[PDB]
Amino acid sequence: LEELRRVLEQLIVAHFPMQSREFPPGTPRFNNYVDCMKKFLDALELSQSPMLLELMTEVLCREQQHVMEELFQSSFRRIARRGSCVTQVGLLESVYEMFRTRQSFVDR
């Protein structure tokens, strides 16, 4: 069950090294980037799986509003409405534990 996040890391590393705007907006690279970030956001929104939540959070929590964080917060809303309370608490504990800039993780 750990192979999932292994390959997640091994793939997403080859996409967003530093920013999302390092590849110019409105360009094929940027366009595919917005496509894939939407794909993860929705698939996870349905899934409500933690590890994906963190991964997309820290990659989001590098540059302020570079990966369309309105979708990010909306995904939080549609997740926190769904799911069992214990599942939500598990996600919250995981994203709390990932806390240990470094600040911006929880902040956003």
């Binding site: 080859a14 996409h15 090294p17 530093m18 390092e22």
Partner: peptide, 18 residues
């Protein structure tokens, strides 16, 4: 990914490329 960018950059215009 921009690793390849500068790798091809420094030998596509043959400059030290600070």
């Amino acid at each position: 990914n921009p690793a390849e960018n500068f790798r091809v950059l420094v030998k596509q215009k043959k400059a030290s490329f600070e």
